[PDB]
């Protein structure tokens, strides 16, 4: 699906997270899988009650993610082209 492909297109850019536990992890996205579980680098953390800390590396489970904020300039990214023309696939 497109929503996950946009998350793969956001690698290496600052993103925000909301876990369903209520916390907020904002920082740079290193890895993401098709299970939506991502790992982030040099991230600032906001606990559900507002206490903010800083951690260098984090890995979160995709099932616990609520929304992900992605740099706005990915809006016009080619994933959202409705009528697009692909070439023929290679024969293997």
């Amino acid at each position: 699906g497109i929503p996950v492909k946009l998350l793969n297109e956001a690698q290496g850019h600052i993103v925000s997270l909301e876990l369903t536990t209520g916390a907020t992890y904002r920082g740079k996205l290193v890895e993401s899988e098709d299970s939506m579980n991502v790992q982030l680098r040099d991230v600032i953390a906001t606990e559900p009650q507002g206490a903010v800390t800083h951690m260098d590396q984090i890995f979160v489970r995709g099932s616990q993610i609520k929304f992900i904020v992605v740099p706005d300039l990915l809006k016009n990214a080619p994933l959202f082209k409705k009528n697009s023309s692909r070439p023929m696939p290679p024969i293997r």
Partner: protein, 75 residues
């Protein structure tokens, strides 16, 4: 289907939050596709660091369903 990539994490001392309240720290040993994570020398962190902290066992395994976030405190 796809295995989670913890490959840089293993053998490093890691803190991870069990459910809402709990936070367990231990040296990551192994993991699977459900993100079930087995680690050794587990310790249950609490408000008072030396006091309320109590070790669990020589080997502990965690169901991937209760895992929320996983941070490595390490290189």
């Amino acid at each position: 289907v796809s295995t989670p990539e913890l490959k840089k994490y293993m053998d490093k001392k890691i803190l991870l939050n069990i459910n809402g309240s709990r936070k367990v720290a231990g040296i990551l040993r192994g993991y699977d596709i459900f993100l079930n994570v087995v680690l050794d020398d587990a310790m249950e962190i609490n408000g008072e660091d030396p006091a309320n902290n109590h070790q669990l066992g020589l080997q502990t395994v965690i169901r991937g369903n209760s895992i929320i976030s996983l941070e490595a405190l390490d290189a």
